[PDB]
Design a protein around this ligand. Structure first.
Ligand code: ZN
Ligand code: ZN
Ligand code: ZN
Ligand code: ZN
Lengths: 285, 98, 295
């Protein structure tokens, strides 16, 4: 059980490793993004990143497809990408085309390309599609949500030349699905209106081939819903329920084959759920 | 295959992905033109001549993008092992520019 | 000064002709039971056969190999009035690409062409029908086209090519009699009847030119009851001569073959004796070793 002795200033805010499991990333309020290498166990410092306009919330490592890339979504108008080229960590690009403070950064499936979504707390969205010269293509939409929209997640690349989809939510006690049309502008579709107080985590679930596409939700109502769909043609997003824990629920993460839905919240602990044959979700640890 | 890549064992990735059912310039020495392939079209001759054994090659072949002198992969191991000079005497520091 | 040795090659029946490759790796024995045996040479020095098949109807007479620059190509001529090209494709099989039947008699000899003139094959028939065939396409070996032909006016037995690779030279072919020289002119684009040495009324078994190596006079060897080595000095009109008459074979000489350096000539006779002839300090020719057929 390897441990990384924290050395930042303020309380840590996030952690996300690399694809092969070789590096780290530590967003914080100390503005430090100090990356640690964990090869064979131990602490180094390949980068002691600095420079933002506010505390950083969420980082998101991109695919090795396109080289070492890290993203930051500080309480700012900063979306900085840090390319770490020529064997040295360094800044590469920033974009301030959003008035409010972003709270989500979720990379797209690698089959499409290199697309980033980062929705701020204004009710807008953005796609930073890479072009092939060294410039982005940032497009947006004027409105998506009433007051929040702080969580965004992507949908597995399936089907036959691709029909892109992704999920958002966090403002109107709601969650919406955006399927972009053949023109290029994000249309809209149904919105899953079955939540109570204030949602925070809006993640999705990896696909394997089974037509049962699922999606979770963690909120301030204390409830967690594991939606389900028999197919994509019936759209019967039937809300089930797993628990009604007392405190606030913060984050939900899936496993590589969706046999775990680990939940962390205000109780300052980690719970490791898993569903049985009867369909009821039970704890393990 | 995606999981196998993620683990760090990557020959097995190609081995597994081999089973899927659904699908997935060099100058000529005679007419002095750009040839697309191991075989020419005008003279119908060999376009790539090995710069070590002076024999025609059609398989795996390294090269320099700058100086433009290439040969068999094993030959480009055997020469480039120690001495860093083009065996055709063009002065290229091929290992520095390739 | 030659030390004999024996090679562990298993051959059931008799063998007619053996020809080496360019590098010294892979003979092409083909004789007896109408078969072609393309052996090889391992790293340890041992020889292991790695090919076999059945040739045309007539007995296989000669087998010749081709340059490494145009793939692995063979060329055999049998008594069935057919010349076989046996190019290897993809692996350890051999597949045909052409077969010429333009000779009304049995094919007597098949010799390739020098690398500098392209990919040419010359075939000699028993009645004196000698034709030169060119294959300009190199990516395809299934195509052929005749270039030119000459009138032997006799019974051809063996032909030889001039290996000279200089720009200021004219290719030629000399045909045995059982004894002339041609000259492929430039403007006319045809073979000719320039000159012919008249010193041997005996039957001729096999002629063989000597490599150039940059000297200013070519050497020709004629196989007869007496081993003959001659010289030609260009001044076109030549300066034909004769500088050797060694006849210690005590039989009929079988074949004459030349070394890479154009210095040592090997001759074999009908008395089962293989003798090598080398030069001396005063530019004289003397024997330098005799080996028995048994060993
Ligand atoms: Zn060409
Ligand atoms: Zn080579
Ligand atoms: Zn070079
Ligand atoms: Zn080079």
């Amino acid at each position: 059980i390897n441990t990384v002795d924290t050395s930042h200033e303020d309380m840590i805010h996030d952690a996300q490793m690399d694809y092969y499991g070789t590096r780290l990333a530590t967003c914080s309020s100390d503005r430090s993004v100090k990356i640690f290498d964990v090869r064979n166990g131990g602490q180094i410092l390949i980068a002691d990143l600095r420079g933002h306009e506010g505390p950083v919330w969420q980082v998101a490592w991109a695919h090795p497809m396109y080289g070492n890339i890290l993203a930051s979504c500080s309480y700012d108008r900063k979306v900085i990408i840090w390319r770490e080229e020529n064997g040295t960590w360094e800044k590469s690009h920033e974009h301030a085309g959003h008035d409010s403070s972003v709270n989500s950064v979720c990379w797209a499936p690698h089959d499409y390309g290199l697309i980033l979504a980062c929705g701020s707390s204004d009710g807008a969205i953005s796609l930073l599609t890479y072009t092939g010269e060294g410039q982005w293509e940032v497009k947006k939409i004027n409105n998506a949500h009433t007051i929040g929209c702080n969580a965004v997640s992507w949908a597995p690349a399936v089907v036959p030349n691709y029909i892109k989809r992704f999920a958002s939510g966090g403002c109107d006690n709601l969650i919406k699905l955006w399927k972009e049309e053949e023109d290029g502008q994000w249309k809209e579709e149904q919105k899953l209106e079955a939540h109570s107080d204030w949602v925070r985590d809006v993640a999705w679930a990896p696909s394997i081939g089974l037509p049962t596409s699922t999606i979770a939700s963690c909120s301030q109502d204390g409830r967690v819903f594991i939606w389900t769909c028999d197919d994509a043609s019936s759209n019967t997003w039937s809300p089930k329920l797993l628990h009604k824990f007392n405190d606030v629920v913060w984050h939900v993460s899936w496993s590589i084959t969706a046999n775990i839905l680990a939940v962390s919240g205000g109780d300052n602990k980690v719970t490791l759920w898993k569903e049985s044959v009867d369909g009821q979700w039970v704890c393990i640890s | 295959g995606e999981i196998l890549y993620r683990w760090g064992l990557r020959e097995k990735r190609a081995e597994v992905l081999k089973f899927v059912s659904c699908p997935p310039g060099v100058y000529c020495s005679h007419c002095r033109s750009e040839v697309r392939g191991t075989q020419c079209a005008i003279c119908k001759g060999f376009t790539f001549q090995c710069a070590i054994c002076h024999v025609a090659v059609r398989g795996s072949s390294n090269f320099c993008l700058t100086c433009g002198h290439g040969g068999h992969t094993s030959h480009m191991m055997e020469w480039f092992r120690t001495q860093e000079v083009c065996p055709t005497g063009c002065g290229c520091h091929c290992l520095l520019e390739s | 000064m030659f030390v004999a040795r024996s090679i562990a090659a298993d051959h059931k029946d008799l063998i007619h002709d053996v020809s080496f490759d360019f590098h010294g790796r892979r003979m092409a024995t083909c004789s007896s039971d109408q078969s072609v045996k393309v052996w090889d040479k391992s790293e340890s020095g041992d020889w292991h056969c790695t090919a076999s098949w059945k040739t045309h109807s007539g007995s296989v007479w000669r087998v010749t190999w081709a340059h490494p620059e145009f793939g692995q190509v063979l060329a055999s001529c049998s008594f069935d009035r057919t010349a076989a090209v046996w190019e290897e494709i993809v692996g350890e099989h051999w597949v045909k690409r052409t077969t010429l039947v333009d000779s009304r008699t049995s094919v007597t000899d098949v010799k390739f062409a020098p690398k500098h003139m392209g990919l040419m094959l010359a075939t000699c028939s028993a009645d004196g029908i000698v034709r030169i065939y060119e294959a300009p396409d190199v990516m395809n070996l299934s195509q052929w086209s005749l270039q030119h032909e000459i009138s032997c006016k006799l019974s051809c037995s063996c032909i030889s090519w001039n290996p000279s690779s200089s720009r200021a030279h004219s290719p030629m072919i000399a045909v045995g009699s059982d004894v002339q020289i041609f000259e492929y002119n430039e403007n006319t684009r045809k073979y000719a009847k320039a000159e012919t040495l008249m010193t041997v009324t005996d039957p001729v078994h096999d002629i063989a030119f000597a490599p150039n190596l940059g000297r200013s006079f070519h050497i020709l060897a004629i196989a007869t009851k007496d081993v003959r080595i001659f010289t030609l000095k260009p001044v076109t009109k030549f300066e034909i001569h004769i500088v050797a008459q060694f006849d210690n074979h005590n039989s009929q000489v079988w074949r004459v073959s030349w070394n890479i350096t154009g210095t040592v000539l090997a001759s074999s006779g009908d008395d089962g004796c293989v003798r090598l002839w080398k030069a001396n300090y005063m530019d004289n020719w003397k024997c330098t070793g005799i080996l028995k057929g048994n060993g």
